[PDB]
Amino acid sequence: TFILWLHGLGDSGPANEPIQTQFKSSELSNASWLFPSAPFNPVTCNNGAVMRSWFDVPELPLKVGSPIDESSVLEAVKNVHAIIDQEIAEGTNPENVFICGLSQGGALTLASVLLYPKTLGGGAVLSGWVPFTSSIISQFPEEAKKTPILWSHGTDDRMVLFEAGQAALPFLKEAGVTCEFKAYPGLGHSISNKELKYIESWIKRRLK
Structure with a gap:
């Protein structure tokens, strides 16, 4: 089993690696986890300040109808x-x-x-x-x-x-x-x- 975890704006992979320690079940014990770190990019909602960011975020808060940015999301998807x-x-x-x-x-x-x-x-x-x-x-x-x-x-x-x-x-x-x-x-x-335990249970159910 491979679990890729993607951090939030400004954060890093190593900062989040301990999340895996909340997945304490036997069933997930052998999982291979990966916590990558986003590149340092300017972020529009932070007035162009540079920080780890997967893709540009124009505005906060995120809402129905908040502006977003597709080419930026696709670079990250790649x-x-x-x-x-x-x-x-x-x-x-x-x-x-x-x-x-x-x-x-x-x-x-x-x-x-x-x-x-x-x-x-x-x-x-x-x-x-x-x-x-x-x-x-x-x-x-x-x-x-x-x-x-x-x-x-x-x-x-x-x-x-x-x-x-x-x-x-x-x-x-x-x-x-x-x-x-x-x-x-x-x-x-x-x-x-x-919330993490429920995700763990869902992964276990998917694995079956």
């Missing part, structure tokens, strides 16, 4: 796909690949899974958003639409509004993708351990 391609080329079954991420990394998770040519084990989005318009749906590969999505979002999030997460559901229905949406009442823009 790199995620290179990682997935190499893992599969080294012999991992595509259905044993899981992509997960927080916020900006959750948006990237979604884009990466939906554009990948093969069905993967799953995409787990934490407090993310849909980082493109419906114009891209025609480009989602046939097998990508079979990859299950688990979307986790805090109801009290004021950085990526809960409504931006709810908006993924009709988008994914249009796209022919199956998504479980898991709301966390009272949670804001952060990860809770219970």
Whole structure:
């Protein structure tokens, strides 16, 4: 099993590696985790300040109708796909690949899974958003639409509004993708351990 975790805006891979220690089950004990780090890019919502960032974010908070940026998301998708391609080329079954991420990394998770040519084990989005318009749906590969999505979002999030997460559901229905949406009442823009345990249980169920 291969689990790729994509950090949020400004953060890094090594800062998030301890997330794996919350996945304490026997079933996930042998998983191969990878926590890459985004390049240093200028970020528009931070007035052009440079920080680790998967793709440019024009505005906060993320909302229904907030501006986004497709060429930037696709540069990031290209790199995620290179990682997935190499893992599969080294012999991992595509259905044993899981992509997960927080916020900006959750948006990237979604884009990466939906554009990948093969069905993967799953995409787990934490407090993310849909980082493109419906114009891209025609480009989602046939097998990508079979990859299950688990979307986790805090109801009290004021950085990526809960409504931006709810908006993924009709988008994914249009796209022919199956998504479980898991709301966390009272949670804001952060990860809770219970949220991670539920993701772990979902991975276990997918593995079967």
